[PDB]
Design a protein around this nucleic acid. Structure first.
Lengths: 194, 193
DNA sequence: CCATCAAAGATCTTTGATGG
DNA sequence: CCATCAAAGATCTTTGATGG
């Protein structure tokens, strides 16, 4: 928990493309990644985009001076990322690689604590547009949930019957009427069916 | 049973990727598909790869000047494939679409007549190599059968415990000791374990 | 830089497993 | 048999690397 100084050799399961978000300091860019050790996996927020070349699938790297909060790891300019050489292996079981790239079932998100990072592809039942926001009703075979997404050109093209890929969304509510909320680092891609 | 001039409306169940083979004049490309009417379904040999855009699942197409031989249909550059009108429905019952894509049980292949086209995914019992061909022993819960496959770098990687994908294989032997043979247009893929 | 084309990832559907 | 959902195949979309 908290800041982790020691080096943590990990394999990179997924490395996404750098995107830009907004803060009080103005435009900033980052990229989402998913890395895993032998025991488990973690979702990674990399605020330094110059490390994109260092994060590649099938590759083993060593991360030090990073942060661990709840459902993910924070890698920033103050951190250090190195490349493995020989002795470093980090064999990840088929189960972890699988569960890291899988969409969690809605019914399972009700037993999850608040602050859980939610990534996956979900079906869209109803789309309720708000002033500064867009309310999405998402569902699967195991149940239903409501997700608050950002309002933009792509998201406004989303309609009932489509799907949405959520990345680094947070769980703001659980149990009955579970809800997800879009954060600052969150990204949502709309997938048009048929 | 032969050359059919009259247009036959059909719905395309599936279309695989085009592949290359060798006979005499050299490389020739084609692809395997499956079409079905309301009455039944067929396996089609398409020798025109430009028809790949014409053959798509869920789409209703009209085929004319096509050859029906024994266990399949033939569509070449000499035939004509057009898009069916809006009044053209061709509604295929779920049981036909299901059966058309399902792997036939070995014990059922015994009752089938010689020349029947066999497509499906089977389990590998034992692999005995030959000179120009490979002998695959395949089995299921309903029995066992042997298939003669082509010899190449792909089929030599197949070992007991693996699974093979048979496409447009023919049944050369029925009853006891049933046998499948790889034809010129036949294709096989080795699925690992 | 753009426009090609080739390599890798994500998506859909039905095929076949799995539990009543 | 029925009902339910993920292995295999195919394709589009992303990416990445290459030539105009």
């Amino acid at each position: 928990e908290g800041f982790q100084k020691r080096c943590l050799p990990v394999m990179v399961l997924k490395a996404k493309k750098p995107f830009t978000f907004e803060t009080q300091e103005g435009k900033q860019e980052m990229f989402h990644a998913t890395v895993a050790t032998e025991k488990e996996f973690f979702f990674v927020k990399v605020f330094n985009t110059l490390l994109k070349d260092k994060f590649i699938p099938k590759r083993i790297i060593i991360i030090a001076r990073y942060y661990r909060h709840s459902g993910f790891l924070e890698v920033n300019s103050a951190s250090r990322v190195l490349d493995a050489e020989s002795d470093q292996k980090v064999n990840v079981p088929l189960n972890i690689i699988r569960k890291a790239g899988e969409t969690p079932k809605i019914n399972t998100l009700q037993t999850q604590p608040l602050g859980t990072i939610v990534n996956g592809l979900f079906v869209v039942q109803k789309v309720t547009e708000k002033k500064k926001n867009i309310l999405f009703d998402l569902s699967d075979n195991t149940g239903k949930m409501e997700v608050l997404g950002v309002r933009n050109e792509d998201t406004m093209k989303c309609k009932e019957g489509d799907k949405v890929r959520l990345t680094f969304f947070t769980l703001s509510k659980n149990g009955e009427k579970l809800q997800l909320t879009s954060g600052v680092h969150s990204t949502i891609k709309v997938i048009k069916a048929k």
